[PDB]
Design a protein around this ligand. Structure first.
Ligand SMILES: [Zn+2]
Ligand SMILES: [Zn+2]
Length: 187
């Protein structure tokens, strides 16, 4: 199938299912659609927003990566054995660029700030094979070291933009994007 998920990235077939929009019949990633069970989404993000939607923006790409990262971690019941193993689960190795390395590091840092990922010195043990991730208390996860990482599904500091399962309205989607703009501002 031709995948037309709004993230506009390949996703490894072992990391996600494919779902179909009932309204426009296109295929999307289950990771980007809340891991919602089953084969369908009643209306995809584009169909809910309507034709004026612009998925090309940096902030919308940040949003979809956050959603994808959270839902992969939820499906995996925690963090993979290393940063690069996580990266190569979220994306196809061959498609990885500096822009999306930065974006994935932003997602990891954000989920750590939000209390979804909780890193500590030595959950799952995680090898740091990429520099540039900052987390509370520890600060920078040092390349070449290992840390323990505890994943929890929700926290009082989480953001709804990655916890919400499905798109429900144009205003909801706009608020998702506003949330990520705010996170970047504070980042
Ligand atoms: Zn996607
Ligand atoms: Zn659709």
């Amino acid at each position: 199938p031709d995948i037309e998920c709004e993230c506009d990235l390949l996703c490894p077939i072992t990391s996600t299912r494919i779902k179909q929009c009932k309204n426009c019949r296109k295929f999307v990633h289950s990771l980007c659609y809340g891991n919602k069970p089953g084969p369908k989404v009643d209306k995809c993000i584009s169909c809910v927003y309507g034709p004026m939607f612009d998925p090309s923006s940096s902030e919308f790409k940040d949003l979809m990566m956050l959603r994808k990262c959270y839902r992969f971690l939820s499906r995996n019941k925690g963090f993979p054995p290393s940063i690069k193993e996580f990266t190569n689960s979220i994306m196809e190795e061959g498609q990885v660029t500096l822009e999306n390395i930065e974006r994935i590091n932003f997602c990891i840092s954000t989920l750590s700030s939000d209390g979804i990922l909780n890193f500590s010195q030595c959950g799952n043990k995680v090898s740091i094979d990429e520099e540039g991730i900052f987390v509370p208390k520890i600060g920078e996860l040092l390349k070449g070291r290992e840390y323990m990482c505890c994943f929890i599904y929700n926290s009082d500091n989480s953001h709804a933009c990655y916890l919400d399962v499905s798109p429900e309205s144009k205003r909801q989607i706009e608020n998702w994007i506003d949330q990520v703009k705010s996170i970047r501002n504070d980042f």
